[PDB]
């Protein structure tokens, strides 16, 4: 889906999946060879990938509550 909701014990995360493709050139930057559900998706994968990219690019939320907005 273009907008994906991630339930979380630390607050739901609203992910603009489609919008992110306007900023991220490759599906592979977040996906395995085949784009689709990510088997090991969770805290570790998310904090490394989601937070990590935001940190390196200086755009996107890195503060807990700015991502865990639910």
Question: Which residues have a Cβ under 8 Å from the Cβ of 36 and sit 6 or more positions away?
Answer: none
User: Are the beta carbons of 9 and 22 closer than 8 angstroms?
Assistant: no
Contact string (CB under 6 A) for ligand HEM, positions 5-44, x = contact: -x-xxx--x-xxx-xxx-xx--x-xxx---xxxx--xxx-
| 21 or 33: CB nearest ligand HEM | 21
Residues binding ligand HEM: number (CB under 6 A): 40
Q: How far is CA 61 from CA 44, 49, 55, 58, 64, in A?
A: 16, 12, 8, 9, 8
Contact call for residue 48 and ligand HEM (CB under 6 A): no
Residue 68 DSSP one-character state: B
Binding site for ligand HEM (CB under 6 A): 4, 6, 8-10, 13, 15-17, 19-21, 23-24, 27, 29-31, 35-38, 41-43, 46-47, 49-51, 53-54, 57, 59-62, 64, 67-68
């Amino acid at each position: 889906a273009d907008v994906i909701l991630f339930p979380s014990k630390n607050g739901a995360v609203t992910f603009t999946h489609k919008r992110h493709s306007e900023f991220v050139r490759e599906c592979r930057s977040c996906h395995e060879k085949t784009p689709g559900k990510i088997r090991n998706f969770g805290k570790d994968y998310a904090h490394k990938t989601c937070k990590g990219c935001h940190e390196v690019r200086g755009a996107g939320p890195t503060k807990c509550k700015l991502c865990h907005t639910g």
